[PDB]
Amino acid sequence: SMSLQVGILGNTFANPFMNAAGVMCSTEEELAAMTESTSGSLITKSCTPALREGNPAPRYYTLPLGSINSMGPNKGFDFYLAYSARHHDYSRKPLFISISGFSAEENAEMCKRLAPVAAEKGVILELNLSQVAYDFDAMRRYLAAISEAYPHPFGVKMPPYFDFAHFDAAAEILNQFPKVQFITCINSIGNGLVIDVETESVVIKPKQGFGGLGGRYVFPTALANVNAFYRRCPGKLIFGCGGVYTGEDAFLHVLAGASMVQVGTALHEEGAAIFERLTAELLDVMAKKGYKALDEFRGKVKAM
Amino acid sequence: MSLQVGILGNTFANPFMNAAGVMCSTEEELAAMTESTSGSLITKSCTPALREGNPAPRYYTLPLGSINSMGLPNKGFDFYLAYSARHHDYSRKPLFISISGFSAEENAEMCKRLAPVAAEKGVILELNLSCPNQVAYDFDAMRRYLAAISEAYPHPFGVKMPPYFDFAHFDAAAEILNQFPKVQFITCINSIGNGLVIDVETESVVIKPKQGFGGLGGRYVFPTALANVNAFYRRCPGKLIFGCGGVYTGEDAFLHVLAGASMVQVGTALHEEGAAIFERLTAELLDVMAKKGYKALDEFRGKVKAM
Numbered sequence A: 001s002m003s004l005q006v007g008i009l010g011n012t013f014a015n016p017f018m019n020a021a022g023v024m025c026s027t028e029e030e031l032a033a034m035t036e037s038t039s040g041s042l043i044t045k046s047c048t049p050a051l052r053e054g055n056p057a058p059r060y061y062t063l064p065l066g067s068i069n070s071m072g073p074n075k076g077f078d079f080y081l082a083y084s085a086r087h088h089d090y091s092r093k094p095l096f097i098s099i100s101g102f103s104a105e106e107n108a109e110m111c112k113r114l115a116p117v118a119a120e121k122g123v124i125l126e127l128n129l130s131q132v133a134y135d136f137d138a139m140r141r142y143l144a145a146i147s148e149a150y151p152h153p154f155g156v157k158m159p160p161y162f163d164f165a166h167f168d169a170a171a172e173i174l175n176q177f178p179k180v181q182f183i184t185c186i187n188s189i190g191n192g193l194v195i196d197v198e199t200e201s202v203v204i205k206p207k208q209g210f211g212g213l214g215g216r217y218v219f220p221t222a223l224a225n226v227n228a229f230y231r232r233c234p235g236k237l238i239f240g241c242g243g244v245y246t247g248e249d250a251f252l253h254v255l256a257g258a259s260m261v262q263v264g265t266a267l268h269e270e271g272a273a274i275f276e277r278l279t280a281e282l283l284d285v286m287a288k289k290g291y292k293a294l295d296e297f298r299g300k301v302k303a304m
Numbered sequence B: 001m002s003l004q005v006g007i008l009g010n011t012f013a014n015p016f017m018n019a020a021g022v023m024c025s026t027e028e029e030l031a032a033m034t035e036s037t038s039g040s041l042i043t044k045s046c047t048p049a050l051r052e053g054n055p056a057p058r059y060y061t062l063p064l065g066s067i068n069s070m071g072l073p074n075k076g077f078d079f080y081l082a083y084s085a086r087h088h089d090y091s092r093k094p095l096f097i098s099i100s101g102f103s104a105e106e107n108a109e110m111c112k113r114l115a116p117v118a119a120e121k122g123v124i125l126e127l128n129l130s131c132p133n134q135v136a137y138d139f140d141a142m143r144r145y146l147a148a149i150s151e152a153y154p155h156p157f158g159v160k161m162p163p164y165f166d167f168a169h170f171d172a173a174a175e176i177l178n179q180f181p182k183v184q185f186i187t188c189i190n191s192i193g194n195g196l197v198i199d200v201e202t203e204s205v206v207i208k209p210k211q212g213f214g215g216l217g218g219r220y221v222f223p224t225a226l227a228n229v230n231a232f233y234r235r236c237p238g239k240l241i242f243g244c245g246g247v248y249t250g251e252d253a254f255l256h257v258l259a260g261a262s263m264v265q266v267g268t269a270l271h272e273e274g275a276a277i278f279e280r281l282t283a284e285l286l287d288v289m290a291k292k293g294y295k296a297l298d299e300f301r302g303k304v305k306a307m
Ligand SMILES: Cc1cc2nc3c(=O)[nH]c(=O)nc-3n(C[C@H](O)[C@H](O)[C@H](O)COP(=O)(O)O)c2cc1C
Pocket: A020, A021, A022, A023, A045, A046, A060, A067, A068, A069, A071, A098, A128, A130, A157, A186, A187, A188, A213, A214, A215, A216, A218, A241, A242, A243, A244, A262, A263, A264, A265, A266
């Protein structure tokens, strides 16, 4: 008599879990394994108009507490659009497409080509602003450009912020664009540095070793961003992303305001079978507490 | 082999010290730091008058570190100046004093009074520009502060910096800092600001102030801390870098030094273990150097292999 269902964007999702953009979603083979998984949904690699080879390797690296990466690598917008057009089994689960064009005009021309597919198949756009989102006049400009070129609602993937002045300023802008129906918090914590004791060298090649962090490192920052935008954007959905390894971690994201919960580093390490464990552990937590639906406690984090 | 550091006209027995705010608010704690094997110590960031700080609970231990929203509980500048002027045993180790006034003028007035004590006793100023419970997140304010202190204070001083997360900010802060010759060291980093922790069982935040949002310390911050140390090591070669963040072992300290750190500060781990941690950290850092054949820290400081 409990359910993990999430009724959002006019879809019933079986559970709140999906992959994070960039993790297990660049190839036909990986997307297939995600659609076959028990996840409530899935999202594609952040694609660019043309195919990109990717930064020099190694571009990812497993850490004791998480991951660091400088991936920079996609089959091109044409590939992922056609996957949404004629290859994704929408009878399994809804599909999100991530785009990260290098310009307002770039993204807009890409949204115009997706508006037909979105209309007839139902794929949902996540616009990766993460940095455009660390510069608020550029953010306001992309969102106006996209809102004018794209009839359909869409969402934004946000970088982490670390002070209330930035939370307030980001939220004030997002609340002026009604087509932005969800906000995903967070992308990686940017430009961390990992060094190997034995070799005395950085562990990824690009950018002198500086890359984005994921995993257990980012969890308190992710919860803070989820809850900060949940409080300030009550008219929008929040998708939590960052540091999820267990169903208790997911429970906390939901308590902070998350509608959907994305899984990055831990999925990279464990594979799509993780979703069978996450749904079970989450139902365990709710069973222990007597909760029957996610709506009963989403955003209900208490003060002391 | 040797852990000695020769900087700022002083000899430090080893690079370790407490992080500002940890084990340094009362005379008993400062005396315990002085009696420890640390190479140095720093006082709690002080304001012109005593403050009781934010209401408790305002510190909480996490699996991988800590979250806090102390809000500068401190005994007031006059207390720490007196400790520096009359109580500290400078034959044991050098001393830093951390000041964190709420405006540039508050800071300048404090520096004016510190100046003669610094001249006579040798205490060294660290200006806190990264009060998260932020000046350095606003670059023209940062430049105003630095000019105010430089006008008010005749000696070299250092600055405690919040973490930055992109090269444009690294470059912006570096460009300002290199314009002020009295800034002789940069401490990277203060807490990662405004994280949030929720207890599963109570479904409630774990610290009371600011809706539970507080600064993160400990293992969460270690890769960010190394990044900031190295970014400023590269962009400010005329200044020393002090590393702070995520140090629990001698290997963690080794990596800070490799990234460029001259001194290595210890916060959360010292809060949990107490001042005997410094006997363990020196032994562990010496063991790392022994396995690699290093006999002095200058043989690998800043020598991270990158690009
Ligand atoms: C290898 C890798 C590739 C990623 N690629 C993208 C991407 O293309 N677009 C995007 O918005 N986020 C990307 N991310 C960030 C993740 O979507 C996620 O925000 C981040 O890893 C934090 O979540 P986690 O703690 O579960 O890993 C990537 C992360 C990793 C580790």
